[PDB]
Amino acid sequence: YFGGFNFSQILPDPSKPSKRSFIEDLLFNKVTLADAGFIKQYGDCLGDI
């Protein structure tokens, strides 16, 4: 209770493992990524599928 101001949407939600709010999840889902090699992906292209 912050004087009637509802901050429950920009504040983090601890149900999900990544401690991100509702609006931050919308921002991360809206901006797609190129899926670069910051995570290792040599073993994905070792198998020819």
Ligand X SMILES: *[C@@H]1O[C@H](CO)[C@@H](O)[C@H](O)[C@H]1NC(C)=O
Positions that interact with ligand X (CB under 6 A): 6, 8-9
CA distance 40 to 18: 20
Would you say 8 or 41 has its CB closer to ligand X?
8
Residue 1 CB, shortest distance to ligand X, in Å, is 8
Tokens representing residue 6 in the block: 């509802």
Would you say 9 or 32 has its CB closer to ligand X?
9
Residue 37 CB, shortest distance to ligand X, in Å, is 39
Question: For residue 39, what is the DSSP state?
Answer: S
CA 15 to chain centre: 13
